[PDB]
Structure formats: C-alpha cells, structure tokens
Amino acid sequence: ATIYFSSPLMPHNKKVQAVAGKRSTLLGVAQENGVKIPFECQDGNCGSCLVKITHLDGERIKGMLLTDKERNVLKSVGKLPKSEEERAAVRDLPPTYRLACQTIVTDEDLLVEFTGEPGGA
Amino acid sequence: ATIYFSSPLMPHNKKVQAVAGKRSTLLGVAQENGVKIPFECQDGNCGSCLVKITHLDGERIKGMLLTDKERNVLKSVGKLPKSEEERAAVRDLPPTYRLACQTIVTDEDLLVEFTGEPGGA
Ligand code: FES
Ligand code: FES
C-alpha cells in the first residue's frame, strides 16, 4: 500500500510504502515513518489523530468502515460521512474524515492529510 | 510516475504508471490508458481537458508550471491558482487546475480528477 502523507507543516508530502494486513493503524504507519500526525489516547476517544483520507485507488465511493468510536468523535466535530448517494453525486472525489488510530492499513493507496494540530484544527 | 485518475464517471479510480523515458502529456497518459478525459484540440486552446491535479509526492505547494494557453483557459473558467502564500496557508492540500494536454508528465505522483464533461463542467 502506498500512502502519501501531507500536512501544512510538511514542505514536502511523504510517500510511504506500507505493508497491508498486520492490523497496523494509519497512525502507526505515520509514527513509523516520522510523520507527525498528532495523537494522544491512541484509542479513538480524544480525536487528536483526525485525518482527511482520499482513496487513491479502488472504489470511488468506498463503503464506510468507521469504528463506533470514530462515529462518536466525528459526530462531535461534524465530520461524519455523507451518505453514499451524496458522496456519489459530487464532482470532486470525496475524502473521508477518519481517526488515524482507528483506521486499519489495507491493500489500497491513500492520500492522508492532517493539519498538524491536534484534532485536525 | 504513478497517476491516479478519478472521475464521477469512473466507479473506481484508475492507478496508472506513466513510464520513464516517454515524453507524454497527462492527456496522452489518460488516452493511452483508456481514461476518458474529454479532449478536442490537444493543443491547450479549447479547454476540454481541464483536470484537477493533486500532487501526491514532492512539494506540498507547487510552483506554477502553467503554459500561457492554460493561464488563458483557467482565467476564463475562474480556476487560476491562488498565490502560493494563500495556498500554503490553507489546511487542505490545494489542488491545481490544469489542462491535461498541456501538462507534461514528470517523475511525480499525481491524483488527477476530472468530471468527464468537456471543460470539467
Ligand atoms: S489519538 Fe485519540 S483519537 Fe486517535
Ligand atoms: S484538449 Fe483542448 S485544451 Fe486540452
């Protein structure tokens, strides 16, 4: 899996090769590659690792894979996904807000944006 | 170079490799890979091949490489880039609108979005 990390704090985006499976978190891949996604609880509660994920390959409108902890945090910040109908109707490729500590690294390519501030602030 | 093509007309994004040593425009890569970016003039005049490019690796904020023809088309559709300072200051990785027939593929990875309608309508 190829992951491109991007942040206002990084003058260059960082391309990372990540081996799929392993139950590796997206935050774990970032931490292993020195990409400073903010984090605290590492457990889907504090919301620090909020990232904006664009799926580069695979389905244009992917089925939603958020954990229940994600859904509570994302609701609290207004970053819950729109439905597949709304997402399919837009002209721009819809990103998905996720918590990086809750996102499992699979065999797909991602662009992962984060502001560098805790909570995606 | 790896180019992910994405469009509402594409149920999956298409991961394409643009090969080394081949001088190609982005439109040429799309045409060779069956990616249905609209085109007509293939010469930067008609605006048909307007795409929204996200630079996946390399610099976060691009020095603009627009041709004079692109600048005219982009001015006409209101898609000229903002200043680099403005682009650097926003939270979301700014894409660049370009004409695919004017964009020379180099050794960088791109996400290339297009609506499927001429001019990106
Ligand atoms: S670090 Fe608390 S939500 Fe991921
Ligand atoms: S095909 Fe006419 S501007 Fe590119």
PDB file of C-alpha atoms and ligand atoms in Angstrom:
ATOM      1  CA  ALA A   1       0.000   0.000   0.000  1.00  0.00           C
ATOM      2  CA  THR A   2       1.275   3.426  -0.914  1.00  0.00           C
ATOM      3  CA  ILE A   3       0.375   6.238   1.460  1.00  0.00           C
ATOM      4  CA  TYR A   4       1.118   9.879   0.795  1.00  0.00           C
ATOM      5  CA  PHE A   5       1.082  11.971   3.939  1.00  0.00           C
ATOM      6  CA  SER A   6       0.500  15.659   3.514  1.00  0.00           C
ATOM      7  CA  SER A   7       0.327  18.475   6.009  1.00  0.00           C
ATOM      8  CA  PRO A   8       0.773  22.268   6.078  1.00  0.00           C
ATOM      9  CA  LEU A   9       3.688  21.564   8.438  1.00  0.00           C
ATOM     10  CA  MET A  10       5.464  19.404   5.821  1.00  0.00           C
ATOM     11  CA  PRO A  11       7.028  21.306   2.885  1.00  0.00           C
ATOM     12  CA  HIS A  12       7.022  18.010   1.020  1.00  0.00           C
ATOM     13  CA  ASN A  13       4.422  15.344   1.111  1.00  0.00           C
ATOM     14  CA  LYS A  14       5.848  12.000   2.215  1.00  0.00           C
ATOM     15  CA  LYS A  15       5.321   8.850   0.150  1.00  0.00           C
ATOM     16  CA  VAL A  16       5.349   5.745   2.328  1.00  0.00           C
ATOM     17  CA  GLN A  17       5.124   2.097   1.343  1.00  0.00           C
ATOM     18  CA  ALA A  18       3.065   0.274   3.975  1.00  0.00           C
ATOM     19  CA  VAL A  19       2.603  -3.474   4.070  1.00  0.00           C
ATOM     20  CA  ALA A  20      -1.092  -4.383   4.183  1.00  0.00           C
ATOM     21  CA  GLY A  21      -2.635  -6.554   6.826  1.00  0.00           C
ATOM     22  CA  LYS A  22      -0.857  -6.628  10.224  1.00  0.00           C
ATOM     23  CA  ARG A  23      -3.769  -4.646  11.777  1.00  0.00           C
ATOM     24  CA  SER A  24      -1.462  -1.610  11.504  1.00  0.00           C
ATOM     25  CA  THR A  25      -3.141   1.677  12.218  1.00  0.00           C
ATOM     26  CA  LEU A  26      -2.741   4.573   9.842  1.00  0.00           C
ATOM     27  CA  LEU A  27      -1.352   6.467  12.825  1.00  0.00           C
ATOM     28  CA  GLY A  28       1.097   3.608  13.385  1.00  0.00           C
ATOM     29  CA  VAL A  29       2.366   3.836   9.797  1.00  0.00           C
ATOM     30  CA  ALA A  30       2.780   7.599  10.225  1.00  0.00           C
ATOM     31  CA  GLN A  31       4.596   7.164  13.552  1.00  0.00           C
ATOM     32  CA  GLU A  32       6.870   4.527  11.996  1.00  0.00           C
ATOM     33  CA  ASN A  33       7.696   6.924   9.164  1.00  0.00           C
ATOM     34  CA  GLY A  34       8.247  10.002  11.317  1.00  0.00           C
ATOM     35  CA  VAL A  35       5.076  11.678  10.079  1.00  0.00           C
ATOM     36  CA  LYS A  36       3.801  13.808  12.946  1.00  0.00           C
ATOM     37  CA  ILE A  37       0.099  13.153  12.966  1.00  0.00           C
ATOM     38  CA  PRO A  38      -0.952  14.417  16.416  1.00  0.00           C
ATOM     39  CA  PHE A  39      -2.121  11.741  18.794  1.00  0.00           C
ATOM     40  CA  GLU A  40      -2.933  11.243  22.434  1.00  0.00           C
ATOM     41  CA  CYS A  41      -5.304   8.497  23.549  1.00  0.00           C
ATOM     42  CA  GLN A  42      -4.431   6.265  20.550  1.00  0.00           C
ATOM     43  CA  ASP A  43      -7.834   4.728  21.167  1.00  0.00           C
ATOM     44  CA  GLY A  44     -10.487   6.637  19.230  1.00  0.00           C
ATOM     45  CA  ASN A  45     -11.563   8.877  22.127  1.00  0.00           C
ATOM     46  CA  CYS A  46      -9.689  12.191  22.211  1.00  0.00           C
ATOM     47  CA  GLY A  47      -9.913  12.876  18.471  1.00  0.00           C
ATOM     48  CA  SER A  48      -6.326  14.131  18.119  1.00  0.00           C
ATOM     49  CA  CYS A  49      -5.498  11.968  15.085  1.00  0.00           C
ATOM     50  CA  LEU A  50      -8.278  13.262  12.837  1.00  0.00           C
ATOM     51  CA  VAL A  51      -7.100  12.937   9.241  1.00  0.00           C
ATOM     52  CA  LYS A  52      -8.640  13.557   5.845  1.00  0.00           C
ATOM     53  CA  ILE A  53      -8.210  10.451   3.685  1.00  0.00           C
ATOM     54  CA  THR A  54      -8.528  10.389  -0.082  1.00  0.00           C
ATOM     55  CA  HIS A  55      -8.644   6.910  -1.526  1.00  0.00           C
ATOM     56  CA  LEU A  56      -6.334   7.000  -4.482  1.00  0.00           C
ATOM     57  CA  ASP A  57      -7.112   3.616  -5.999  1.00  0.00           C
ATOM     58  CA  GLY A  58     -10.064   1.314  -5.593  1.00  0.00           C
ATOM     59  CA  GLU A  59     -13.687   2.358  -5.374  1.00  0.00           C
ATOM     60  CA  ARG A  60     -14.531   5.992  -5.978  1.00  0.00           C
ATOM     61  CA  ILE A  61     -17.227   5.816  -3.326  1.00  0.00           C
ATOM     62  CA  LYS A  62     -15.990   3.337  -0.765  1.00  0.00           C
ATOM     63  CA  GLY A  63     -18.305   1.728   1.742  1.00  0.00           C
ATOM     64  CA  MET A  64     -17.870   3.301   5.098  1.00  0.00           C
ATOM     65  CA  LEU A  65     -15.552   1.469   7.534  1.00  0.00           C
ATOM     66  CA  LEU A  66     -15.604   3.751  10.581  1.00  0.00           C
ATOM     67  CA  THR A  67     -15.471   2.303  14.059  1.00  0.00           C
ATOM     68  CA  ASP A  68     -18.187   3.241  16.546  1.00  0.00           C
ATOM     69  CA  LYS A  69     -15.641   5.319  18.450  1.00  0.00           C
ATOM     70  CA  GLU A  70     -14.834   7.195  15.226  1.00  0.00           C
ATOM     71  CA  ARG A  71     -18.544   7.836  14.620  1.00  0.00           C
ATOM     72  CA  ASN A  72     -18.921   9.401  18.077  1.00  0.00           C
ATOM     73  CA  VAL A  73     -15.826  11.606  17.655  1.00  0.00           C
ATOM     74  CA  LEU A  74     -16.669  12.529  14.053  1.00  0.00           C
ATOM     75  CA  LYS A  75     -20.231  13.444  15.077  1.00  0.00           C
ATOM     76  CA  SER A  76     -18.798  15.687  17.805  1.00  0.00           C
ATOM     77  CA  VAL A  77     -16.743  17.566  15.182  1.00  0.00           C
ATOM     78  CA  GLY A  78     -19.280  17.453  12.340  1.00  0.00           C
ATOM     79  CA  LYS A  79     -17.060  15.196  10.224  1.00  0.00           C
ATOM     80  CA  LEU A  80     -19.361  12.231   9.819  1.00  0.00           C
ATOM     81  CA  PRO A  81     -19.530  10.937   6.220  1.00  0.00           C
ATOM     82  CA  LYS A  82     -22.355  11.931   3.995  1.00  0.00           C
ATOM     83  CA  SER A  83     -24.312   9.036   2.541  1.00  0.00           C
ATOM     84  CA  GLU A  84     -23.098   7.147  -0.487  1.00  0.00           C
ATOM     85  CA  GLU A  85     -25.813   8.915  -2.540  1.00  0.00           C
ATOM     86  CA  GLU A  86     -24.493  12.368  -1.569  1.00  0.00           C
ATOM     87  CA  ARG A  87     -20.877  11.228  -1.993  1.00  0.00           C
ATOM     88  CA  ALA A  88     -21.562   9.682  -5.404  1.00  0.00           C
ATOM     89  CA  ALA A  89     -23.324  12.836  -6.591  1.00  0.00           C
ATOM     90  CA  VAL A  90     -20.438  15.227  -6.065  1.00  0.00           C
ATOM     91  CA  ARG A  91     -17.992  16.058  -8.840  1.00  0.00           C
ATOM     92  CA  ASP A  92     -14.851  16.103  -6.678  1.00  0.00           C
ATOM     93  CA  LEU A  93     -13.505  12.861  -5.234  1.00  0.00           C
ATOM     94  CA  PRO A  94     -14.970  12.845  -1.729  1.00  0.00           C
ATOM     95  CA  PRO A  95     -12.451  12.383   1.042  1.00  0.00           C
ATOM     96  CA  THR A  96     -13.259  10.627   4.270  1.00  0.00           C
ATOM     97  CA  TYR A  97     -12.505  12.070   7.660  1.00  0.00           C
ATOM     98  CA  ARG A  98     -11.147   9.337   9.888  1.00  0.00           C
ATOM     99  CA  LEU A  99      -9.245   8.948  13.123  1.00  0.00           C
ATOM    100  CA  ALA A 100      -5.779   7.698  12.146  1.00  0.00           C
ATOM    101  CA  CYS A 101      -5.560   5.498  15.268  1.00  0.00           C
ATOM    102  CA  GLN A 102      -8.785   3.755  14.219  1.00  0.00           C
ATOM    103  CA  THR A 103      -8.009   3.338  10.507  1.00  0.00           C
ATOM    104  CA  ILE A 104      -6.594  -0.059   9.534  1.00  0.00           C
ATOM    105  CA  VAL A 105      -3.948  -0.097   6.804  1.00  0.00           C
ATOM    106  CA  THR A 106      -5.141  -2.339   3.937  1.00  0.00           C
ATOM    107  CA  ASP A 107      -4.036  -3.031   0.356  1.00  0.00           C
ATOM    108  CA  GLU A 108      -5.020   0.301  -1.108  1.00  0.00           C
ATOM    109  CA  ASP A 109      -3.387   3.615  -1.797  1.00  0.00           C
ATOM    110  CA  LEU A 110      -4.172   6.693   0.245  1.00  0.00           C
ATOM    111  CA  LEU A 111      -3.566  10.383   0.423  1.00  0.00           C
ATOM    112  CA  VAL A 112      -3.662  11.319   4.095  1.00  0.00           C
ATOM    113  CA  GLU A 113      -3.955  14.983   5.008  1.00  0.00           C
ATOM    114  CA  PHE A 114      -3.684  16.357   8.515  1.00  0.00           C
ATOM    115  CA  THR A 115      -3.289  19.924   9.682  1.00  0.00           C
ATOM    116  CA  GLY A 116      -0.571  19.127  12.218  1.00  0.00           C
ATOM    117  CA  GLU A 117      -2.718  20.493  15.072  1.00  0.00           C
ATOM    118  CA  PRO A 118      -4.420  18.075  17.476  1.00  0.00           C
ATOM    119  CA  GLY A 119      -7.937  17.293  16.363  1.00  0.00           C
ATOM    120  CA  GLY A 120      -7.309  18.423  12.802  1.00  0.00           C
ATOM    121  CA  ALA A 121      -7.591  22.041  13.962  1.00  0.00           C
TER     122      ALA A 121
ATOM    123  CA  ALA B   1       5.331   8.048 -12.207  1.00  0.00           C
ATOM    124  CA  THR B   2       2.080   6.954 -10.647  1.00  0.00           C
ATOM    125  CA  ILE B   3      -1.078   8.762 -11.703  1.00  0.00           C
ATOM    126  CA  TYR B   4      -4.450   8.044 -10.123  1.00  0.00           C
ATOM    127  CA  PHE B   5      -7.267   9.110 -12.399  1.00  0.00           C
ATOM    128  CA  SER B   6     -10.590   9.821 -10.789  1.00  0.00           C
ATOM    129  CA  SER B   7     -13.930  10.915 -12.176  1.00  0.00           C
ATOM    130  CA  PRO B   8     -17.632  10.600 -11.287  1.00  0.00           C
ATOM    131  CA  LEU B   9     -17.831   8.516 -14.461  1.00  0.00           C
ATOM    132  CA  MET B  10     -15.278   6.069 -13.038  1.00  0.00           C
ATOM    133  CA  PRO B  11     -16.605   3.683 -10.374  1.00  0.00           C
ATOM    134  CA  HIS B  12     -13.005   3.014  -9.468  1.00  0.00           C
ATOM    135  CA  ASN B  13     -10.126   5.361  -9.652  1.00  0.00           C
ATOM    136  CA  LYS B  14      -7.526   4.080 -12.093  1.00  0.00           C
ATOM    137  CA  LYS B  15      -3.944   3.694 -10.929  1.00  0.00           C
ATOM    138  CA  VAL B  16      -1.753   4.249 -13.968  1.00  0.00           C
ATOM    139  CA  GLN B  17       2.018   4.218 -14.279  1.00  0.00           C
ATOM    140  CA  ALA B  18       3.454   6.734 -16.714  1.00  0.00           C
ATOM    141  CA  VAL B  19       6.714   5.267 -17.835  1.00  0.00           C
ATOM    142  CA  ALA B  20      10.202   6.671 -17.760  1.00  0.00           C
ATOM    143  CA  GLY B  21      11.807   7.970 -20.923  1.00  0.00           C
ATOM    144  CA  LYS B  22       8.477   8.570 -22.648  1.00  0.00           C
ATOM    145  CA  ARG B  23       7.659  12.206 -23.167  1.00  0.00           C
ATOM    146  CA  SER B  24       3.919  12.374 -22.578  1.00  0.00           C
ATOM    147  CA  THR B  25       1.285  14.860 -21.709  1.00  0.00           C
ATOM    148  CA  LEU B  26      -1.116  13.981 -18.933  1.00  0.00           C
ATOM    149  CA  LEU B  27      -3.841  13.723 -21.574  1.00  0.00           C
ATOM    150  CA  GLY B  28      -1.607  11.357 -23.534  1.00  0.00           C
ATOM    151  CA  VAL B  29      -1.263   9.127 -20.454  1.00  0.00           C
ATOM    152  CA  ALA B  30      -5.029   9.162 -19.994  1.00  0.00           C
ATOM    153  CA  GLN B  31      -5.660   8.377 -23.662  1.00  0.00           C
ATOM    154  CA  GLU B  32      -3.183   5.532 -23.651  1.00  0.00           C
ATOM    155  CA  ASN B  33      -4.833   4.058 -20.549  1.00  0.00           C
ATOM    156  CA  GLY B  34      -8.428   4.491 -21.671  1.00  0.00           C
ATOM    157  CA  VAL B  35      -9.127   7.236 -19.179  1.00  0.00           C
ATOM    158  CA  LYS B  36     -11.846   9.334 -20.715  1.00  0.00           C
ATOM    159  CA  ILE B  37     -10.612  12.821 -20.102  1.00  0.00           C
ATOM    160  CA  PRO B  38     -12.516  14.899 -22.684  1.00  0.00           C
ATOM    161  CA  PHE B  39     -10.325  16.466 -25.319  1.00  0.00           C
ATOM    162  CA  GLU B  40     -10.550  18.118 -28.689  1.00  0.00           C
ATOM    163  CA  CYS B  41      -7.746  20.420 -29.745  1.00  0.00           C
ATOM    164  CA  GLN B  42      -4.961  18.661 -27.741  1.00  0.00           C
ATOM    165  CA  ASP B  43      -3.212  21.994 -28.030  1.00  0.00           C
ATOM    166  CA  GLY B  44      -4.275  23.997 -24.992  1.00  0.00           C
ATOM    167  CA  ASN B  45      -6.888  26.109 -26.771  1.00  0.00           C
ATOM    168  CA  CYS B  46     -10.281  24.562 -26.234  1.00  0.00           C
ATOM    169  CA  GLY B  47     -10.206  23.864 -22.505  1.00  0.00           C
ATOM    170  CA  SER B  48     -11.796  20.439 -22.914  1.00  0.00           C
ATOM    171  CA  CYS B  49      -9.160  18.555 -20.951  1.00  0.00           C
ATOM    172  CA  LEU B  50      -9.358  20.597 -17.742  1.00  0.00           C
ATOM    173  CA  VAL B  51      -8.330  18.475 -14.776  1.00  0.00           C
ATOM    174  CA  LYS B  52      -7.860  18.999 -11.069  1.00  0.00           C
ATOM    175  CA  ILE B  53      -4.426  17.742 -10.082  1.00  0.00           C
ATOM    176  CA  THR B  54      -3.265  16.919  -6.585  1.00  0.00           C
ATOM    177  CA  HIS B  55       0.471  16.419  -6.301  1.00  0.00           C
ATOM    178  CA  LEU B  56       0.858  13.358  -4.155  1.00  0.00           C
ATOM    179  CA  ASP B  57       4.590  13.462  -3.599  1.00  0.00           C
ATOM    180  CA  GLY B  58       7.139  16.204  -3.851  1.00  0.00           C
ATOM    181  CA  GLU B  59       6.452  19.789  -2.791  1.00  0.00           C
ATOM    182  CA  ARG B  60       3.249  20.456  -0.900  1.00  0.00           C
ATOM    183  CA  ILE B  61       2.808  23.790  -2.682  1.00  0.00           C
ATOM    184  CA  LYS B  62       3.681  23.821  -6.363  1.00  0.00           C
ATOM    185  CA  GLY B  63       5.475  26.457  -8.258  1.00  0.00           C
ATOM    186  CA  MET B  64       3.083  27.035 -11.074  1.00  0.00           C
ATOM    187  CA  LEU B  65       4.055  25.400 -14.341  1.00  0.00           C
ATOM    188  CA  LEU B  66       1.084  26.612 -16.372  1.00  0.00           C
ATOM    189  CA  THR B  67       1.507  27.240 -20.055  1.00  0.00           C
ATOM    190  CA  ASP B  68       0.287  30.582 -21.424  1.00  0.00           C
ATOM    191  CA  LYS B  69      -2.612  28.717 -23.024  1.00  0.00           C
ATOM    192  CA  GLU B  70      -3.533  27.168 -19.675  1.00  0.00           C
ATOM    193  CA  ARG B  71      -3.445  30.541 -17.981  1.00  0.00           C
ATOM    194  CA  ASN B  72      -5.888  31.900 -20.544  1.00  0.00           C
ATOM    195  CA  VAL B  73      -8.239  28.941 -20.241  1.00  0.00           C
ATOM    196  CA  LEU B  74      -8.003  28.882 -16.443  1.00  0.00           C
ATOM    197  CA  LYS B  75      -8.621  32.619 -16.260  1.00  0.00           C
ATOM    198  CA  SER B  76     -11.703  32.123 -18.402  1.00  0.00           C
ATOM    199  CA  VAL B  77     -13.125  29.436 -16.107  1.00  0.00           C
ATOM    200  CA  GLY B  78     -12.031  31.160 -12.904  1.00  0.00           C
ATOM    201  CA  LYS B  79      -9.580  28.405 -11.972  1.00  0.00           C
ATOM    202  CA  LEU B  80      -6.297  30.245 -11.896  1.00  0.00           C
ATOM    203  CA  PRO B  81      -4.242  29.293  -8.840  1.00  0.00           C
ATOM    204  CA  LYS B  82      -4.292  31.495  -5.832  1.00  0.00           C
ATOM    205  CA  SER B  83      -0.980  32.868  -4.670  1.00  0.00           C
ATOM    206  CA  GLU B  84       1.490  30.462  -3.123  1.00  0.00           C
ATOM    207  CA  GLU B  85       1.097  32.217   0.225  1.00  0.00           C
ATOM    208  CA  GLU B  86      -2.658  31.640   0.146  1.00  0.00           C
ATOM    209  CA  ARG B  87      -2.177  28.042  -0.964  1.00  0.00           C
ATOM    210  CA  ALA B  88       0.361  27.407   1.787  1.00  0.00           C
ATOM    211  CA  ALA B  89      -1.904  28.908   4.428  1.00  0.00           C
ATOM    212  CA  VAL B  90      -4.945  26.715   3.873  1.00  0.00           C
ATOM    213  CA  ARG B  91      -5.479  23.482   5.750  1.00  0.00           C
ATOM    214  CA  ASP B  92      -6.456  21.239   2.830  1.00  0.00           C
ATOM    215  CA  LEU B  93      -3.753  20.304   0.252  1.00  0.00           C
ATOM    216  CA  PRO B  94      -4.564  22.678  -2.591  1.00  0.00           C
ATOM    217  CA  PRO B  95      -5.022  21.042  -5.949  1.00  0.00           C
ATOM    218  CA  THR B  96      -4.018  22.666  -9.196  1.00  0.00           C
ATOM    219  CA  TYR B  97      -6.335  23.025 -12.141  1.00  0.00           C
ATOM    220  CA  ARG B  98      -4.519  22.306 -15.380  1.00  0.00           C
ATOM    221  CA  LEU B  99      -5.157  21.359 -18.969  1.00  0.00           C
ATOM    222  CA  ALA B 100      -4.145  17.732 -19.271  1.00  0.00           C
ATOM    223  CA  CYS B 101      -2.952  18.272 -22.840  1.00  0.00           C
ATOM    224  CA  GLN B 102      -0.615  20.993 -21.557  1.00  0.00           C
ATOM    225  CA  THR B 103       0.690  19.112 -18.525  1.00  0.00           C
ATOM    226  CA  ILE B 104       3.931  17.269 -19.136  1.00  0.00           C
ATOM    227  CA  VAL B 105       4.195  14.132 -17.056  1.00  0.00           C
ATOM    228  CA  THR B 106       7.344  14.120 -14.968  1.00  0.00           C
ATOM    229  CA  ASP B 107       8.647  11.947 -12.143  1.00  0.00           C
ATOM    230  CA  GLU B 108       5.975  12.798  -9.626  1.00  0.00           C
ATOM    231  CA  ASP B 109       2.850  11.080  -8.462  1.00  0.00           C
ATOM    232  CA  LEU B 110      -0.495  12.706  -9.155  1.00  0.00           C
ATOM    233  CA  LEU B 111      -4.147  12.376  -8.367  1.00  0.00           C
ATOM    234  CA  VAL B 112      -5.986  13.641 -11.429  1.00  0.00           C
ATOM    235  CA  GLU B 113      -9.674  14.380 -11.107  1.00  0.00           C
ATOM    236  CA  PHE B 114     -11.942  15.290 -13.960  1.00  0.00           C
ATOM    237  CA  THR B 115     -15.684  15.462 -14.281  1.00  0.00           C
ATOM    238  CA  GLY B 116     -15.930  13.684 -17.603  1.00  0.00           C
ATOM    239  CA  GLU B 117     -17.641  16.681 -19.211  1.00  0.00           C
ATOM    240  CA  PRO B 118     -15.571  18.902 -21.536  1.00  0.00           C
ATOM    241  CA  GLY B 119     -14.004  21.703 -19.629  1.00  0.00           C
ATOM    242  CA  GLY B 120     -14.611  19.939 -16.337  1.00  0.00           C
ATOM    243  CA  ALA B 121     -18.234  21.096 -16.313  1.00  0.00           C
TER     244      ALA B 121
HETATM  245  S1  FES C   1      -5.373   9.672  19.254  1.00  0.00           S
HETATM  246 FE1  FES C   1      -7.205   9.959  20.421  1.00  0.00          FE
HETATM  247  S2  FES C   1      -8.432   9.541  18.647  1.00  0.00           S
HETATM  248 FE2  FES C   1      -6.623   8.746  17.715  1.00  0.00          FE
HETATM  249  S1  FES C   2      -7.804  19.200 -25.457  1.00  0.00           S
HETATM  250 FE1  FES C   2      -8.133  21.370 -25.934  1.00  0.00          FE
HETATM  251  S2  FES C   2      -7.272  22.382 -24.154  1.00  0.00           S
HETATM  252 FE2  FES C   2      -6.619  20.276 -23.965  1.00  0.00          FE
END
